[PDB]
Amino acid sequence: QTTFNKAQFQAALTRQWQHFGLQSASEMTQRQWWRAVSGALAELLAAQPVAKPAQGQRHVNYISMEFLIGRLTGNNLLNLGWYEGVSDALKGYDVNLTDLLEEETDPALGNGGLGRLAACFLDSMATVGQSATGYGLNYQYGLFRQSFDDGQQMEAPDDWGRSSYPWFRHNEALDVQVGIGGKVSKNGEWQPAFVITGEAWDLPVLGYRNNVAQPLRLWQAKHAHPFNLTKFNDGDFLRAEQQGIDAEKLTKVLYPNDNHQAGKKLRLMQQYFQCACSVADILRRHHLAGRKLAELADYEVIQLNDTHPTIAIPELLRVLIDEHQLSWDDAWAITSKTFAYTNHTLMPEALECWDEKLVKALLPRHMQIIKEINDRFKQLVDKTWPGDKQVWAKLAVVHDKQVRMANMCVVGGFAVNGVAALHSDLVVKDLFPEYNQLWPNKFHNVTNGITPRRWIKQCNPALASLLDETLKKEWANDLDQLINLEKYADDAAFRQTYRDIKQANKVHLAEFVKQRTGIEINPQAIFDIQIKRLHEYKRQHLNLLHILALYKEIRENDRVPRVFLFGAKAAPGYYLAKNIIFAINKVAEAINNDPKVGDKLKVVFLPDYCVSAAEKLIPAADISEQISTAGKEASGTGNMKLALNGALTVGTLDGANVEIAEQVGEENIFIFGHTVEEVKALKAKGYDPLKWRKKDKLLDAVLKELENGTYSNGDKHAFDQMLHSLLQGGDPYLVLADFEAYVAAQKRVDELYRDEEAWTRAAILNTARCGMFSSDRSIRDYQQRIWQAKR
Amino acid sequence: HHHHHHMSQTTFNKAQFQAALTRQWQHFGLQSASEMTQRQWWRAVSGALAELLAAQPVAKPAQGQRHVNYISMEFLIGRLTGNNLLNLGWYEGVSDALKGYDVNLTDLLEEETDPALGNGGLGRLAACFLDSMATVGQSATGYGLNYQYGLFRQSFDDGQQMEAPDDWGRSSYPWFRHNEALDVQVGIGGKVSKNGEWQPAFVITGEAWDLPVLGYRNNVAQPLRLWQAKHAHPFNLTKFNDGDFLRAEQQGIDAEKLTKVLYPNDNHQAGKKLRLMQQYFQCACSVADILRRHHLAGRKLAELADYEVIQLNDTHPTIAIPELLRVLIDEHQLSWDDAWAITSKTFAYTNHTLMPEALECWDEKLVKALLPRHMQIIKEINDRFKQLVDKTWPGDKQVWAKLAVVHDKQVRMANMCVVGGFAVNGVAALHSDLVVKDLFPEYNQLWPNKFHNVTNGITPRRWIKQCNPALASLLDETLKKEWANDLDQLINLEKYADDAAFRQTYRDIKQANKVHLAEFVKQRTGIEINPQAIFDIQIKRLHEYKRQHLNLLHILALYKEIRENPQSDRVPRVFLFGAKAAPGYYLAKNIIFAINKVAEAINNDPKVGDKLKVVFLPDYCVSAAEKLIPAADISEQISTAGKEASGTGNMKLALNGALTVGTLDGANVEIAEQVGEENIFIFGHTVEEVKALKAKGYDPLKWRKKDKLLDAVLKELENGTYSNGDKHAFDQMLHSLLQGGDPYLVLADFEAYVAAQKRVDELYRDEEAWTRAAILNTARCGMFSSDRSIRDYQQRIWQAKR
């Protein structure tokens, strides 16, 4: 690892403020300082020699519609080992590095766990030495920036300075032309009606202390003729920009509303644009390496993260057949050995499908290709289930004027994997059982993971230092070493040091909470954290009901003091989720100001949850809330972050809680509530939440407080949408049915927290036993089972 | 006169250049310099030079001299990379270094689209002036707009002018620097409260995008600060999620439209409103930036005029005057008298206009709606000026109607400039006299020290040393003293007109320039032009009064003469045009159509062959001018007498050795005086003769019936000869010449023009007498250096006592 060169950094920093047009470094604003330091570091990085790839290893092309990368400058310094050198150089300018890093708005490039998984996997590939390129979209405004207006969620664009972001590099020789719409001539020539330019905007992915730097390649859409001077000179200044906007709209927003025809068409264009550019770029790299097209699968593999990039399959077929004149069988022999598909889905109804009419109109050549895939696949299905029209309707790639993208992924690729042992079994038994009959060796598991660089070393540096002194071998790229901590759970000095670190993290969070909300929270209390997206089945309103129960007990009658912290976004137009957010904020207003409670209870809903906020919340967690309805979580990478940093999990037996309980032991986790099978049986027998209300005085009471205006200044319909989902709507995620199990589990939490030694033992054991959650281990599993396997 | 400019050439450093180049292709994400495309090579070389420039020591401003803020709505700067290398003295060093990469520097420079930041001579004057201020050590900032698409990019489709956006990679242009600390907030519309607080309806951010203006071998680098408009909240997520993707961008597009296009069509109300917003945005940003510099230098607001002067190039930035009053009054609580005491000693105004009817005016209804607080300030200017007019012409209502700043619901911007400033100047001796006599005689009575002349000029760096390096090195070898920042040295060339070896070298250079233009013409049009022919060049904007169609009728006459007599003794000719017609200018576009159709016929007629070709080079620009001007034998300067104040193109062509065929008006007057009547071809009706002819009732139909040659060439345009039978092809041009009354006297000057062009043949036949005349045009035109212009501005206005 090349060491920090202070004189080179100084010369690079000087070039930055000279380029701004300033006379000295001291003239910079705090924003300019962050841009200049980041740009200087980018210059030094770009001068570093490129560590060459491992011979005889396939290069991985990882395609994802989100990359939730978080801030990059601090992460890059940690991976290079330059943090201390830069920190000290900046003290010479009276600049505080840690404060400067807070100038960076998180690049708004992803939404949730799907995009954070892609980011952790890029980081791990760079660290374990898997040559790879990430392929995404360079979104200008992300999903949205969340704020609270009288407790209601408000949505604005999440701008992040995309065009001026200092870590970008743009090689214009990688621009790609993408066609849209039009017709296919009688002789098979696609004549698009609209053409878009894709520019590659590259961010660096740095490996840990190994001089590896690989690209996250983010495509940005533009038009070659965006502006119509005739319309401008006629006075129509807005419509003059129309052609440009029709291209640039592809990379404005992540997951824009698709409940209408314009938005459905937009989503499909985004996916195709991403895949046409990516496919062109992969073939260009292969060609410039002097490699033959027929051997593409020997040198390259393409990982499809969910079904969003499915269209890459017929796009690659299109290029091979139409632009390189390969036979169908020769083209398919390549694509069918190049594409692998990662499934994140639990129910068949959630698999992605497109109206054939929209695909035909938008991508007429691809629709012909897709129908030929479909027609050729029918021969095999009829061989195996002769005359069975029902099996064909299920397995078809096109049927009833519908294109089944997940089906096309299974039929068109050599591997399918789920993201946890139980999920990957369900992929085979529930989603694709017939396909598994045809192609048993196609299906695999790779359990998800998280990078220990960002999520321990960077956000929890004091815990990281403890691990450095205690463990014999390096652990930051060898997380299985954490198991050697088990012994120190019995050492009273270790315990005291470890618990002190957790308390110092809770104090640090207290500051951050007081800056954003002004609320003062009690660091002696239990920090009880739920950081899931806001969806009904995540049951933030189950959390709410328990909080109301705690609030009620304090108002009347020795519970441990608590601080409930929430971070969650709701999709725009998801009115029920937004009403749950409204209730939580309204109830927190009462609790935080009510003098009857004081320092016994506070609720903090931090707005605009993002990677940067998670780095501050997660090291401070005592309790990790993982209370989704059993059956509805395949994984849970947040769960893994929280456990490794020494929070204890309260949760249902599903998703990543299964893995955590398996590793840490029943003494060290709080599993509760209906199992997957018990949820199904309760609905099968007839579940009425109203009957459960009638027999539960505490439950009826907290729900009365939400119906009678106690938290809305006398509006009885403030929380109307939440309450109807729980009562006449039928409570389909079983908030009431799990209520008393949850309340009872949380009482066990109190008891452990009073036994300070036993609590700390449990926390240490969560850190020590969860080394398997490293995304380095995930990547090695992908390498052995899929990417580097023999075809 | 002996000028002593402090020379300071930091020498080229090949190692530093190599390291900067390496950072550029590393920043592109490449593995070696050799991977670069041609376009990347230009970006990398230009960006490396920008890094080295930014690392040079910054020249400090001259002690005790006012700083000049030069505000213009256009800056026609041309390509920067080659000019910057020449001013730095690094051209040969970079050329040699690039040979080590097998890169040819002169080829690489051609990758650059001219920054589309100006239109014609008004903007090129502003660019020559900025270059000269840097070279003479006048501390200065130019203030303009960072137009994304310029005026338009010109092409020809079946001979007709087509107009497209003139995109030039604005946001990625490698010489730009942007200091976000200079961003300015600009308000639009709204209302003024009863307490006098302006509450705007729309707010726009102005970003300063700076280009460097480099002096000649003196390490001076000064900013051309170009404002670009943006909105702080350009994008509406609710509308995007509703599927209204274009309307989602409305707020941003409504701000950005201010710096999209230069001189957008204002034939309609939306365009008029846009132009006024463009002008206000430029002036609000510039005024804020000037005050910021003054305040950061620790200087007192009351002393602004002792340290700063603001030059208004034409009336487009007039609104800067009430804008500075607004800031002084509303934001610094100055009384009107104390504010006016500052502004009236800070602003100076350069007039380019000839007719009172052409002076810029705005509807009061529109100024009130867009700038309600400024309208109040402007009325106060008006009301206070009336008290002065009352004292001098009491109760005279016609005088007041003439001099008022606001009258009959119109705001007179030129009047506001005179009333509100301390100096007014015209751009040539005779023009500046007419400004006082015809335009502003009453103002000159009130303020007899306010009016001046400063004759225009051009920079010798771009317009001789860069575009004509062979002539430059002849001047170097011959004069043995530096002439590029001391152009009056050219007068020492006079005697070399009698040195046959010099004449031969000077002639070899003209001919080599013609060969180089022939290559470029072949590359751009496919036409092979004859380098032994007279290269006859007209490079004016396309306007009826520039009379490109007088040139056309003469071409037709020459074509007829040598078609009907293959034994004709006329000298071979190549007629070259560069000209854009403003969008929507239908007559000018029909003149273009006629020229291109006649050229098509001539160029493909084997009867004439290499005796005659006509080349209309599309998309005339600075870079095209640098190829055409050094190759010119004849400089066409044939506007109707009375319609030209100046003619900077005229000066460039004369210095590079072309002889002028022109009317006695504009810059031709001063050229003819300097070079002598024997060395120029003045023709046609005088200014006075034009006026008298029209008053006697001029009827072009009568002239046509008495002139059989004129009748014959016009018939060729009427009967489908050049039109594949379409007799209506040139209806608009023919009508303007005939039933329309020929207002610019094309027919009246035709035979005088034909006769002058025959004298051109006769001189060109004796290459000694021709070369002698050309040498003496180069030798005697040193006064047309923009360095001399700047010295005059300094002595008379910028550094004068108030």
Ligand SMILES: *Cc1c(COP(=O)(O)O)cnc(C)c1O
């Ligand atoms: C890790 C992470 C996630 C995923 O966490 P889950 O509990 O699986 O939803 C989402 N957002 C951010 C910012 C994260 O860091």
Ligand SMILES: *Cc1c(COP(=O)(O)O)cnc(C)c1O
């Ligand atoms: C010098 C110049 C002008 C001004 O020339 P005129 O003959 O006065 O119109 C206009 N355009 C360009 C490109 C020039 O170089």
